[PDB]
Structures are given as C-alpha cells and as structure tokens.
Design an enzyme around this catalytic site. Structure first.
Site, PDB file in Angstrom:
ATOM      1  N   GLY A   1      88.705  26.585 -36.715  1.00 51.50           N
ATOM      2  CA  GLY A   1      87.649  27.219 -37.480  1.00 51.50           C
ATOM      3  C   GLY A   1      87.689  26.760 -38.931  1.00 51.50           C
ATOM      4  O   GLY A   1      88.384  25.808 -39.315  1.00 51.50           O
TER       5      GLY A   1
ATOM      6  N   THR B   1      94.823  28.116 -27.352  1.00 50.19           N
ATOM      7  CA  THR B   1      95.202  27.360 -26.179  1.00 50.19           C
ATOM      8  C   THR B   1      95.567  28.322 -25.045  1.00 50.19           C
ATOM      9  O   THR B   1      95.325  28.058 -23.861  1.00 50.19           O
ATOM     10  CB  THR B   1      96.345  26.380 -26.524  1.00 50.19           C
ATOM     11  OG1 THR B   1      97.516  27.120 -26.883  1.00 50.19           O
ATOM     12  CG2 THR B   1      95.928  25.502 -27.712  1.00 50.19           C
TER      13      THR B   1
ATOM     14  N   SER C   1      95.135  26.834 -35.419  1.00 50.76           N
ATOM     15  CA  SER C   1      96.055  26.505 -34.332  1.00 50.76           C
ATOM     16  C   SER C   1      97.178  27.529 -34.220  1.00 50.76           C
ATOM     17  O   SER C   1      97.699  27.993 -35.243  1.00 50.76           O
ATOM     18  CB  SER C   1      96.624  25.102 -34.529  1.00 50.76           C
ATOM     19  OG  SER C   1      95.589  24.148 -34.382  1.00 50.76           O
ATOM     20  N   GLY C   2      97.508  27.908 -32.985  1.00 51.94           N
ATOM     21  CA  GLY C   2      98.623  28.814 -32.729  1.00 51.94           C
ATOM     22  C   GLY C   2      98.193  30.271 -32.711  1.00 51.94           C
ATOM     23  O   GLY C   2      98.948  31.154 -32.311  1.00 51.94           O
TER      24      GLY C   2
ATOM     25  N   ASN D   1     100.144  25.267 -41.584  1.00 55.89           N
ATOM     26  CA  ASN D   1     100.351  25.328 -40.145  1.00 55.89           C
ATOM     27  C   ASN D   1     101.265  24.187 -39.669  1.00 55.89           C
ATOM     28  O   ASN D   1     101.078  23.041 -40.074  1.00 55.89           O
ATOM     29  CB  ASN D   1      99.001  25.274 -39.437  1.00 55.89           C
ATOM     30  CG  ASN D   1      99.079  25.720 -37.989  1.00 55.89           C
ATOM     31  OD1 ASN D   1      99.825  25.148 -37.177  1.00 55.89           O
ATOM     32  ND2 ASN D   1      98.313  26.749 -37.659  1.00 55.89           N
TER      33      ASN D   1
ATOM     34  N   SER E   1      99.006  22.009 -36.241  1.00 58.88           N
ATOM     35  CA  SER E   1      97.555  22.158 -36.350  1.00 58.88           C
ATOM     36  C   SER E   1      96.792  21.055 -35.635  1.00 58.88           C
ATOM     37  O   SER E   1      97.036  19.871 -35.879  1.00 58.88           O
ATOM     38  CB  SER E   1      97.139  22.189 -37.818  1.00 58.88           C
ATOM     39  OG  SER E   1      95.736  22.366 -37.946  1.00 58.88           O
ATOM     40  N   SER E   2      95.871  21.438 -34.750  1.00 55.17           N
ATOM     41  CA  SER E   2      94.960  20.459 -34.130  1.00 55.17           C
ATOM     42  C   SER E   2      93.960  19.889 -35.128  1.00 55.17           C
ATOM     43  O   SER E   2      93.257  20.640 -35.780  1.00 55.17           O
ATOM     44  CB  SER E   2      94.196  21.089 -32.978  1.00 55.17           C
ATOM     45  OG  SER E   2      94.977  20.998 -31.820  1.00 55.17           O
TER      46      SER E   2
ATOM     47  N   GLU F   1      88.517  26.082 -42.624  1.00 56.52           N
ATOM     48  CA  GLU F   1      89.815  25.859 -43.255  1.00 56.52           C
ATOM     49  C   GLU F   1      89.681  25.791 -44.778  1.00 56.52           C
ATOM     50  O   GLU F   1      88.972  24.918 -45.310  1.00 56.52           O
ATOM     51  CB  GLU F   1      90.470  24.590 -42.713  1.00 56.52           C
ATOM     52  CG  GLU F   1      91.854  24.327 -43.246  1.00 56.52           C
ATOM     53  CD  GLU F   1      92.540  23.165 -42.552  1.00 56.52           C
ATOM     54  OE1 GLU F   1      92.462  22.036 -43.075  1.00 56.52           O
ATOM     55  OE2 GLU F   1      93.182  23.380 -41.495  1.00 56.52           O
TER      56      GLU F   1
END
Ligand SMILES: [Ca+2]
Ligand SMILES: [Ca+2]
Ligand SMILES: [Ca+2]
Ligand SMILES: [Ca+2]
Lengths: 733, 133
Positions: free
Chosen positions: A423, A161, A156-157, A199, A202-203, A425
């Site tokens: 992806g 997005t 995420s980040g 993070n 994080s999604s 982790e």
C-alpha cells in the site's frame, strides 16, 4: 450541539493513546469556550468546533464499520480495538472492504469445518473472514461469468501473504497448485524483496496470482504475473537499506564449494550491496535463506545447472558494479588493464574481455556512423542501466520458469487473480521509490472509488432512492502521469545533460506551484515537493530522482551478452533501450490496471497493530498510521458524507417501539416508521425511505439511541417513584 | 430533613395542594391501596387527628401525629407473588400494571436489569432493598 449534554462521552486527543475518552460534566451552552470533562483527573477543554462524540454501545464492536453512526477516526480505532482485544476478532468489514488485523498468533479459524461453514453462504450472513471474500469472488465468477481479482494490500508482513495463502486454500477446498505457489515464495522473496528502513522483508513489486478454473470451476493451475519491480534498488540503496535479498544470500554463501567460481566478497565489498551500510538483518541468516531459496528452485523444477546460471548472473551483476572507470579527461574514460571485476564478470558471463571492455567505454553513433568514446559519467550510467536490465530480465526468466511448473495443459475457462501489493508508503525521507509506489496506489484507489460508486448506484436503485458522492482522484493521477506532469517533466529533464535535481525542482514549481492545489512546496526548501495523495500529503526530496530515472542501455553492450558462450544469458534477451525507469513504471502500472479493470475487484486490507510481533497487541499510533495508509480512514470519511447507516423497517421497529405512542402505531409498520421518524427527526434531509430500508445520515442513529436511552432512564426513575408513593402511603395508613 | 419527608408524605394525601386533607382525598388514597372505607370510617379517622375540629387535617396537625426493614420485606412479598424469593420481570410487570403505571415490556426489563446487581436476570431481596433506597 444538543448532543453535548451532561455525562455525554467524547474523544479528545492524547499524545500516547491518540484518542482518549472523556465524559461531560456540565452541559455545553452555545457560546461556552470550555468543556468540563472527566478522564478516568478533570479537564477544561480548549474550544469554534466540538470534539468527536462516542458511539452508543449498541453499535460498538459491530461486524461492519459503516454501521457506526458517528463515523470518524476515533470510532474506527476504538471499534477495531475492542473487537480485536476483547473478542479476539481479527476480521472486520468496512463496507465491501475486509480489514484484517495481524494477531501474531496462529488462530484455529482456517480448518475444514469453517471452510464448509462459509461455503454456500452469502456475504454478510456470516462473520467477516477472508474465506467470505474468497466465497464471494468464487460465487460471482460462476454467477456473472466474469473473472475476479482479490486485491490484498498493505505493508509487507502485516498479513498479505497469509491472507493470500488462505484464499487459495479455500478455492482448493471448495473446488498441487496451492502447494506449488507456496513453495515458490522463497524464490520470489529472494529476488523481489528487500530490507528498507522500516521493513526487513518488504515486497518491491506487485504479485498477481491467476488461479485458473475449467468450465466446471475447478482449479486447473496458476499463472504468476509481476508488475512494478523497483529497478532503482539494483544499483542504489539509501542509508540502512539493502538491495534484494538474494545478493546477500549469495555473499553470505561465498565460501561454499559450489560458489567458489563466483568469487564473492562479503556484502560490504560490493558497490551494489554496500551503500546502505547494513549487510545484515537481526534475526535473519542469509546463508540459511540461500539454502531455502535453492531448495525452492528445486521444488519448482529449475535444474541445478540453471540454478547455477542464476547465480552466475547475479555474481556477474555484483562484479559489474565494481568495475572502475578511469577518466582520460574528460569526454573519455577507460578500464584499467586486466581489471579484476571485469575479468570475473566476463568469465561468469561467458563473454570476451576486450570486446566487453570496448563497449563499456564506447558508444556506437549512427547520415554517418562514428564510434564515440564516452565520459566516465556516461559509462557508469550505462553500466548501471545494463545491471538493471540484466536483473529485470533475469527476474522475468525466473518467473516464466516458475510458471512452467504452474501451468496446466487444460483449457482455461476463467480465473480469480489474487494481487499481493504494497500500500501507500511514506518515510521520513521519501524518494523516487516511494513516489512510484504512491502513484500505483492512486491508480488502484481509483478503481476502488469507481467500483464502490457503481455498487452504491445499484443499491440506491434497488431500494428506489435517487442520487450521491464521488471523490475523484483523476487530478492527482494527472498531476503524476499527464504531459508536463511530474513523470513527464522528470523525463524531459533527464535528456538534458545540464539537467539536475535542482533544475527539475524549479520546473516543477514553474509548472504546478499555485496552478495545481494538490501540489505544494515546502517554505524552506527548493529541493523538495509535496503531493496531496488520496490518504495523506507526502513530501518528496528531489535528490537522486534524475539518476534513478535514467535507464539507457547501450545496444552494443547487450549484443556482446547475446553472443555469450554462457547459454542461459541470451535466453534473458529473447529505445526501448532508452526508456526510463519512471516511464517503464508507468507502462507496467497501466498493464496491471488493464488486467484489474477487466475483472470484478474484491478488497482485503491487512494491517500491523504493533511493531514487535506482539500477539494480540494494539498500538493506537501504529494502527492509525496503518489504517490511513491502507485508505480506510479516507474511504470512511467519504462514506460518512452520504447515508452510511442502513436499517430494515423491521429493525427500526424492533429497536424504537419504546419511542412510539400507541396512537401512531399502525398495521402498515413501514408507514409507522415513516411517520414516527418524521416526528423524532424534523430535518427530512437526515434520512431517506427505501423499498426495504431506511438510510440515515451520520449521527442520526446515534441520536435515536440517545432518545431511547433517555426514555428508559425516565421509565426507571418513574417506576421507583410510584413505589415510593405506594410505600409512603402504606406506611402512614 | 425528616420533616421534609413528612411533607412529601403529606403531599401524597393532599392531592389539590390546598393545604388540607379532606375525607375524600383520604378515601381516594385508601381506595388506591386496595382499601374500601365508608365515609363514616374516613370521618372518624380524619377527626382523630383534626386538632382544630375544622373537619380537615393540615400539615401541623399531621406532623404532630406522625411524631422500615419490615416495611420493605412486606413490600417485597407483594411483588414476589410466587414467594420464590426472586422478583421476575413478569411479577414486576404484574404489580406495576396493578399500581396504575403503564409501562412497555422493554421498560420493565430495563428496571430488572438495573436492579439485578448479581446479573442473574431476576431481583432477590437485598437487590430489592438496594434499589428502593
Ligand atoms: Ca386537599
Ligand atoms: Ca383541622
Ligand atoms: Ca418469584
Ligand atoms: Ca439477581
């Protein structure tokens, strides 16, 4: 081994830059044990295996990584670096994959003229860009009458997005919806994202945005599908992690007039939000974010009263986790009389205290029907299960209602789905959470492998070349999800009340150790196991796996809620109550793959080049880590095993005439190339001739590039000499 | 040193490396440089430095006889056939072709590239001097 001559450059390890360039002083004689290197200090390299060779500079900075002839980790790193830092290029191809490196800077490459430039063009005739991937999916939708998926993965980040934002922008432009989807983001982030140890935002789920099109391929509307929600996080957090954002947004808005009924303490006061010891994130104002989240519900048509329902249900969940059970030893428990968290729960949830209390402490047992008292442990397990069930159903309810503002009455003829997905982790300490994520990656990766294999087949056949390599990750997938696999053994162990993390560990060993090469055991531990995933080995600690997998919701507790006076609550619920988190994860994942497999996939990998949001700043350690986790390094190792370099006969001529005599130059230039190449490169397995292209194994184009360099270097010393003779003779006459 | 230079020069003339420069070898070198001497002229030239009257000239006869800025300038003016003070790849391909040596256009362009220190696509005087050195 004749490549390692004088002045030849190589990459050697470096503790700080990962890979360091070095130049050979003395030629390497087959038998030597040390290389005489020169850093920009001289070295004595400790050799039987030689270090990585640098690519010739004509291949450096190319649009497509698979054009590198020495196709290895430092080549990849260096090429992305120079393109990113020297040329400010954030986009690079890796075969069909688009690699996007986050510049942490707003670039002017997304405007209308650029969209119009990409429109109508072919993949590869333009520079790498998110718009090209978008244009491909759009083109192939109409052309093949097939639905498309754009899979955008990464941490995420790192830019997922943003990539999705511009895919949509592109579709909207070449064909409202992009606006509404963007507006829902703070909603989805608040219920679907959390701070983890690595993070802050994080999604913890995959978001699949179906962009719908009519018969004329114009956008009519969208449909958001969600998968892989991380249930365990609702009632558990590791050190330094938080539950989902919205709980903190609420607990930071505890004093607002409208929220006084919720009777929220601060985050450190709730069992479900305090376990990680990190109620705040530096730079984040949860109170502010609450406002943004409330605004977003408004923009998406969720009534102010329904929004309050949402907040009642979340506070409910918070108070529920604080309900304390009292052991009336030892197969028996109760709740203290007029227990505050229960009173608040029941009030917020519109249910009766005694009725709720009873079914929090009893089980209905149905040849006979008894009402069994339960132990504290069983009661806490059931309560937690209920909390997770309430949350998930709420999450769905919210998504459904977002979808109401996105659907169109128009019949839908086709769609392009953009998947926003994490992806690979890997933390220092990996648990059930990471295990599920990497499971999901093994499945997505498989779709990717098979897809690339298919396209390779077509490309070989199109060029009239026989076949080729397939690197199958079914064994890993099976080790995870088949009978007697990791997930299945975990479920087995959970239905045994004498089961523990340690007994489970042991059965993993008895089943898989020295039976499956992808399974390993750390030498000094019986409380952990090691999986060889696609991109890397990962060690999981067994601790907590049984507790996080359990998920048995007591039917009678749900029935109480279904009869609530709070009329939103029953809308959530309009085995399976004994399914398991891991099993539900499996189900959700298989659903996702069903959607994905029924489409042509396209791939975007988004990476973080540094840890501090530094504009165009390339940290080699971070990048290698990011490239590995997104699968690029492994994919490239696979590419590097076949025939990755691919040149038109035209291009071969244009570059390597200088290597040709006139005695072998023909009119059939293609036949010239065949005969010329069979002379320069004797091993015929190093290349294959096709209808319009030559396919080279790794290294081969680089070798040709050294011959070309050699020739031009000799041509120059020769010119210089024949002007030294001419000027010496003229001196003396 | 300077001596070994003279040797390298001697060897340019002494084609067969037999240790002596005949009139034929002289006329060969001379004809090369756009000169066209008669045998007579060649003999008188070889006799001028033939100490032992043996008809041919050896190194020590040579070394005895022989014992730059202008030379390079004169050389530059030969390449630069359009006197504009810049040597183009064309002008250099013209001269090298003349000189006997058969190069490709890529080989020529490379030589220009290497000698073109100020990266302007052609070779000026100081660049020419710098490359000859
Ligand atoms: Ca002779
Ligand atoms: Ca003599
Ligand atoms: Ca000129
Ligand atoms: Ca110049």
């Amino acid at each position: 081994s004749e490549l390692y001559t004088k002045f030849a450059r190589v990459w050697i390890p470096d503790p700080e830059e990962v890979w360091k360039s070095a130049e050979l002083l003395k030629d390497y004689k087959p038998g030597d044990k040390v290389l005489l290197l020169h850093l920009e200090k001289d070295l004595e390299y400790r050799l039987g295996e030689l270090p990585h060779l640098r690519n010739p500079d004509i291949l450096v900075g190319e649009n497509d990584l698979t054009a590198l002839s020495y196709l290895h980790e430092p080549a990849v790193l260096h090429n992305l670096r120079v393109r990113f830092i020297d040329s400010k290029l954030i986009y690079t191809y890796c075969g069909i994959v688009l690699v996007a490196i986050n510049p942490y800077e707003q670039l002017p490459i997304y405007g209308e003229d650029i969209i119009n430039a990409y429109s109508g063009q072919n993949m590869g005739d333009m520079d790498p860009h998110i718009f090209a991937v978008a244009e491909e999916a759009y083109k192939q939708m109409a052309r093949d009458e097939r639905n498309q998926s754009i899979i955008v993965s990464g941490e995420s980040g790192a830019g997922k997005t943003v990539s999705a934002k511009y895919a949509m922008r592109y579709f909207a432009t070449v064909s409202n919806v992009e606006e509404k989807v963007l507006a829902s983001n703070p909603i989805m982030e608040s219920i679907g994202n959390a701070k983890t140890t690595r993070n802050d935002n994080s999604s913890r789920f995959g978001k699949y945005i179906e962009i719908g099109f009519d018969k004329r391929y114009r956008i009519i509307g969208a449909n958001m599908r969600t998968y892989l929600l991380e249930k365990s996080r609702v009632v558990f957090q590791a050190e330094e992690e938080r539950n989902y954002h919205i709980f903190y947004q609420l607990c930071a808005s505890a004093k607002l007039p409208e929220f006084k009924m919720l009777r929220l303490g601060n985050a450190d006061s709730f069992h479900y939000t305090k376990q990680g010891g990190s109620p705040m994130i530096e730079g984040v104002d949860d109170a502010k974010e609450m406002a943004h989240t409330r605004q977003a519900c408004t923009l998406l048509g969720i009534s102010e009263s329904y929004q309050m329902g949402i907040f009642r249900i979340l506070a409910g969940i918070l108070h529920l986790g604080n309900v304390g059970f009292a052991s009336r030893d030892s197969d028996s428990c109760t709740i203290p009389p007029k227990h505050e968290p229960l009173t608040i729960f029941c009030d917020l949830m519109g249910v009766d205290y005694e009725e709720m209390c009873h079914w929090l402490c009893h089980r209905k047992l149905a040849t006979e029907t008894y009402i069994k008292p339960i132990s504290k442990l069983q009661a806490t397990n059931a309560r937690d299960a209920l909390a997770k069930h309430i949350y998930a159903k709420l999450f769905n309810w919210i998504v459904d209602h977002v979808n109401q503002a996105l659907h169109s009455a128009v019949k839908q003829h086709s769609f392009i789905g953009v998947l926003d997905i994490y992806g690979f982790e890997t933390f220092e300490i990996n648990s059930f959470e990471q295990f599920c994520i990497n499971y999901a990656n093994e499945k997505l990766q498989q779709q990717f492998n098979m897809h690339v294999f298919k396209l390779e087949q077509e490309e070989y056949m199109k060029e009239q070349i026989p076949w080729i390599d397939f690197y199958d990750n079914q064994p890993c997938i099976n080790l995870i999800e088949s009978k007697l696999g990791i997930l299945d053994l975990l479920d087995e162990e959970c239905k045994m009340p004498k089961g523990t993390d340690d007994t489970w560990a042991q059965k993993l060993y008895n089943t898989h150790l020295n039976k499956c090469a992808l399974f390993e055991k750390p030498r000094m531990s019986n409380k952990a196991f090691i999986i060889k995933h696609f991109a890397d080995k990962v060690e999981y600690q067994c601790e907590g796996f049984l507790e996080k997998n359990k998920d048995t919701v007591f039917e009678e507790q749900i029935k109480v809620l279904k009869s609530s006076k709070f009329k939103m609550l029953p809308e959530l619920f309009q085995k399976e109550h004994k399914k398991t988190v891991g099993h539900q994860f499996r189900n959700s994942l298989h659903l996702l793959m069903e959607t994905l497999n029924a489409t042509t996939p396209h791939y975007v990998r988004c990476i973080k080049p540094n840890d501090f949001k530094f504009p165009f700043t390339f940290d080699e350690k971070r990048a290698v880590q990011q490239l590995r986790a997104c699968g690029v390094l492994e994919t490239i190792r696979i590419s590097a095993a076949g025939f990755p370099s691919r040149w038109t006969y035209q291009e071969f001529f244009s570059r390597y005439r200088v290597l040709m005599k006139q005695k072998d130059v023909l009119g059939d230039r293609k036949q010239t190339c065949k005969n010329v190449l069979e002379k320069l490169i004797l091993d015929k397995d190093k290349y294959q001739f096709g209808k319009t292209k030559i396919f080279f194994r790794a290294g081969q184009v680089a070798y040709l590039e050294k011959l070309r360099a050699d020739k031009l270097r000799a041509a120059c010393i020769r010119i210089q000499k024949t002007i030294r003779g001419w000027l010496l003779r003229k001196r003396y006459l | 040193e300077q001596i070994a230079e003279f040797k390298e020069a001697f060897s340019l003339f002494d084609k067969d490396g037999d240790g002596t420069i005949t009139t034929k070898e002289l006329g060969t070198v001379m004809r090369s440089l756009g000169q066209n001497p008669t045998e007579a002229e060649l003999q008188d030239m070889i006799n001028e430095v033939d100490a032992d009257g043996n008809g041919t000239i050896d190194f020590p006869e040579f070394l005895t006889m022989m014992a730059s800025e202008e030379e390079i300038r004169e050389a530059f003016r030969v390449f630069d056939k359009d006197g504009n003070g810049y040597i183009s790849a064309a002008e250099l391909r013209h001269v090298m072709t003349n000189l006997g040596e058969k190069l490709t256009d890529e080989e020529v362009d490379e030589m220009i590239r290497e000698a073109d220190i100020d990266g302007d696509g052609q070779v000026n005087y100081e660049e020419f001097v710098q490359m000859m050195t």
